[PDB]
Amino acid sequence: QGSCSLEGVEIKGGSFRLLQEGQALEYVCPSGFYPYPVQTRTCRSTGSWSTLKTQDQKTVRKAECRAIHCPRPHDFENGEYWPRSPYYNVSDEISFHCYDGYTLRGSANRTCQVNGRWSGQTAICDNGAGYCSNPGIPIGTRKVGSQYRLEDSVTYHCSRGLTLRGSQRRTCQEGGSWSGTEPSCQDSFMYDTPQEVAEAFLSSLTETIKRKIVLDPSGSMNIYLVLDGSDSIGASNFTGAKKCLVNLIEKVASYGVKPRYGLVTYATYPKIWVKVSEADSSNADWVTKQLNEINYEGTNTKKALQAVYSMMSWVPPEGWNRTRHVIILMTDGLHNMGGDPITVIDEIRDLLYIGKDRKNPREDYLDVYVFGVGPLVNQVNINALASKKDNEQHVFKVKDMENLEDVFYQMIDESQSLSLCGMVWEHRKGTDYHKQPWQAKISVIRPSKGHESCMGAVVSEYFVLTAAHCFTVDDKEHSIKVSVGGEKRDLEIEVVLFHPNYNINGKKEAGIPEFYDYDVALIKLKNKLKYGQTIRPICLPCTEGTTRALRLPPTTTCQQQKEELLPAQDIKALFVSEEEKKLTRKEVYIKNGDKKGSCERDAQYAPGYDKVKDISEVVTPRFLCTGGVSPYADPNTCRGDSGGPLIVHKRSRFIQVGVISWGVVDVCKNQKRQKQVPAHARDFHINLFQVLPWLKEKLQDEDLGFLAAA
Ligand SMILES: *[C@@H]1O[C@H](CO)[C@@H](O[C@@H]2O[C@H](CO)[C@@H](O[C@@H]3O[C@H](CO[C@H]4O[C@H](CO[C@H]5O[C@H](CO)[C@@H](O)[C@H](O)[C@@H]5O)[C@@H](O)[C@H](O[C@H]5O[C@H](CO)[C@@H](O)[C@H](O)[C@@H]5O)[C@@H]4O)[C@@H](O)[C@H](O[C@H]4O[C@H](CO)[C@@H](O)[C@H](O)[C@@H]4O)[C@@H]3O)[C@H](O)[C@H]2NC(C)=O)[C@H](O)[C@H]1NC(C)=O
Ligand SMILES: *[C@@H]1O[C@H](CO)[C@@H](O[C@@H]2O[C@H](CO)[C@@H](O)[C@H](O)[C@H]2NC(C)=O)[C@H](O)[C@H]1NC(C)=O
Ligand SMILES: *[C@@H]1O[C@H](CO)[C@@H](O)[C@H](O)[C@H]1NC(C)=O
Ligand SMILES: *[C@@H]1O[C@H](CO)[C@@H](O)[C@H](O)[C@H]1NC(C)=O
Numbered sequence: 001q002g003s004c005s006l007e008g009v010e011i012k013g014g015s016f017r018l019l020q021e022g023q024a025l026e027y028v029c030p031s032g033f034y035p036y037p038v039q040t041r042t043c044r045s046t047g048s049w050s051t052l053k054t055q056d057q058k059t060v061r062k063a064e065c066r067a068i069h070c071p072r073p074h075d076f077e078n079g080e081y082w083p084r085s086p087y088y089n090v091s092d093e094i095s096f097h098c099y100d101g102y103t104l105r106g107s108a109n110r111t112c113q114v115n116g117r118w119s120g121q122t123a124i125c126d127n128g129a130g131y132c133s134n135p136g137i138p139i140g141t142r143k144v145g146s147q148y149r150l151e152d153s154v155t156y157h158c159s160r161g162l163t164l165r166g167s168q169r170r171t172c173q174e175g176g177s178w179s180g181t182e183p184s185c186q187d188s189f190m191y192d193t194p195q196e197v198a199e200a201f202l203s204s205l206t207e208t209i210k211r212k213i214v215l216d217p218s219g220s221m222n223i224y225l226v227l228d229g230s231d232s233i234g235a236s237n238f239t240g241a242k243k244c245l246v247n248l249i250e251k252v253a254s255y256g257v258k259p260r261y262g263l264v265t266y267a268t269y270p271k272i273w274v275k276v277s278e279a280d281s282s283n284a285d286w287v288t289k290q291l292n293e294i295n296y297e298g299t300n301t302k303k304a305l306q307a308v309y310s311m312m313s314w315v316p317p318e319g320w321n322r323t324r325h326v327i328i329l330m331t332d333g334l335h336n337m338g339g340d341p342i343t344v345i346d347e348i349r350d351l352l353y354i355g356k357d358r359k360n361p362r363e364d365y366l367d368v369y370v371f372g373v374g375p376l377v378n379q380v381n382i383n384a385l386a387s388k389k390d391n392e393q394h395v396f397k398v399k400d401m402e403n404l405e406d407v408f409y410q411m412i413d414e415s416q417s418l419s420l421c422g423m424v425w426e427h428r429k430g431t432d433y434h435k436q437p438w439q440a441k442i443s444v445i446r447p448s449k450g451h452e453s454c455m456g457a458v459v460s461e462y463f464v465l466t467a468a469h470c471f472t473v474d475d476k477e478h479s480i481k482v483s484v485g486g487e488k489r490d491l492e493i494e495v496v497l498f499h500p501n502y503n504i505n506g507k508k509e510a511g512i513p514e515f516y517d518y519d520v521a522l523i524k525l526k527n528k529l530k531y532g533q534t535i536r537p538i539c540l541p542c543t544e545g546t547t548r549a550l551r552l553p554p555t556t557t558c559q560q561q562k563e564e565l566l567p568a569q570d571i572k573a574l575f576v577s578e579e580e581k582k583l584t585r586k587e588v589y590i591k592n593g594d595k596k597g598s599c600e601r602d603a604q605y606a607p608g609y610d611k612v613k614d615i616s617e618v619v620t621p622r623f624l625c626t627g628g629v630s631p632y633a634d635p636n637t638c639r640g641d642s643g644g645p646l647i648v649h650k651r652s653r654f655i656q657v658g659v660i661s662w663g664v665v666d667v668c669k670n671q672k673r674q675k676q677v678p679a680h681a682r683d684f685h686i687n688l689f690q691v692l693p694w695l696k697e698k699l700q701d702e703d704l705g706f707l708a709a710a
Pocket of ligand 3: 236295
């Protein structure tokens, strides 16, 4: 129905997006900030948007993007943690310690992450004296029940405003394990990244060898794909969901198994498109064609699952107890009408004889996975339906249909060679070089003087891309060393190739001491790099690799890539910064639209450039601009980060669009110090789309598949 004026709804330090044809909105904040007091607003029948309220229901005059905090532990049994603060800022560290007589499991040291979650696993102090282990208290939750004898239970509770994910109750079972799965508390801003979801789903569905799906000997598997099309998932005849599912089917087929598929879409009533009992339902290619053909057109989930039950049911056939069943539900709402769908899951577990025998519980024979999409999904309800299995995750919440698609594109990219450009798997126990495998450190030794330390990016097995200003003609190759993958070993180089138009010394006679135009160089290594989990290439602009990374058709041009990667907007990008051996991603915004001119003009504030009459003489068409307070407070590069890649993270892949070149002011660590970061604190980076003929030439034997560079 009627629409609401957007006057006055702006959020300080953030933006918003419209949902449900203008009837709702969601606020959007930079990395490390969340919308206060509310994630979403609804358009009211008055023409005004819903009021901004806190928990206690105090009106807030103005919405703001506020620093994320990780929750303080409510309690820690049989030990102490420290430091103890009301709340923790991103990158705060605590540590956990047991009392005498108790032994620590889980993570001793934990760090508050950019997503509002503590790193690692729940710390537990246990004396081994219970029938069951001490189940622990995940940070953010409160536990009721402190006896761990056989058949005792513990219950968990979240704070007002938050929602519990996982088991609200766990029960101590014969053999010494707890039923259900470890809980966590979800705040309104929290989403799972596609990379996290891709690792969590795969490691739930499969066993590790490569990976495999194990069935019974002479054993079967049925997969039920259920799509709630009541809201936006049905948009464009389920186009998004079809992409996801095509990719899922393709991934499952990689494991050599031939499952039977069911396909059901639903809203008020269910539609069965493919039935598991069909002669062709185990033909992956046939099922894929059927799925691609489906179309649209309240949320009756109970009925959708009753369509699933009817596909299952059957006195019973041979090998009924040999089949494992996987339900996959995709939803952006799940506000159920027509009854609680949970009772149907109960009926299913009766049918499959699950939970009916203590000596043979048969939990392996059913898995229900729920993928929630967007800010409007009912979190209690998606969790209620999803399986609860120890050390497994079965409930996901992603931002977007685009992000849901990214989950399955990542899963498809997993088995590809390590040469796959700008792909990073979300290794659970990975370090900094598992998260930025392309990162190179460059050192140059200079007699009686400070050594140069710069950054670069691995672009092929022989090449590291960096800035030219890290080197002069006087630097012999033996003085220059490169390290990759966080290894002590520093690698010998063959040569440094400078862009042929680069000349720091200008322009010096014209009154300009440093001229950074064309500030790019390639280091050719002496020896070929062996790729691995901590050493992998980043994607470069205008190559076949990037077309594929962006999920685009093979006829895609370099102009099409530029349009996708550097449109005339404020572009979300990132660089990697090192602080005390740790690498952290710092999100920045490239001013490539109306703000470009004002970003560029701030160069006059740079030292040496104060007398420059015409700013274009120092800021050339080769340059990209980040920094400043508009639209957002951008972080700035440190001296050590120079030459490093400026990166766009799109479709689960990392594409380097720039090289970190020079900055207006050194203001780096006003970060955790304050700040007082000036509004004219800009960083200038060399745009790689502006030096492609040189790149394509130098890297011509590296098998990168460059497109037309002119
Ligand atoms: C964890 O991280 C948080 C977030 O970074 C951090 O919190 C900061 O803590 C410092 C030190 O305690 C605070 O600094 C104090 O500032 C007091 C003035 O506060 C008002 O003005 C701030 C400045 O506003 C300008 O700039 C900002 C950003 O550039 C811009 O948004 C504004 O428009 C404006 O131009 C403003 O940020 C601040 O707003 C916060 O707090 C209000 C609550 O009133 C809230 O409405 C906002 O949502 C926002 O969160 C506020 O309006 C100043 O009085 C004070 O001076 C004191 O000196 C010492 C203590 O240092 C004392 O003796 C005495 O109290 C003096 O008054 C001091 O300089 C800063 O405000 C915080 N920033 C926040 C909350 O955003 C924590 O320190 C980190 N550490 C941990 C573990 O908590
Ligand atoms: C928790 O962190 C502490 C402090 O950083 C770790 O102890 C240090 O570990 C490093 C790297 O292994 C050593 O170089 C130091 O000798 C240790 N110094 C100390 C005792 O302060 C500790 O290993 C961490 N605990 C874990 C991961 O269990
Ligand atoms: C969905 O496809 C059907 C074809 O059966 C068509 O009627 C309709 O135009 C499509 N809807 C879209 C693309 O929004
Ligand atoms: C399935 O049922 C039959 C008959 O009870 C039995 O012989 C077979 O072993 C069962 N399979 C199991 C235990 O999963």
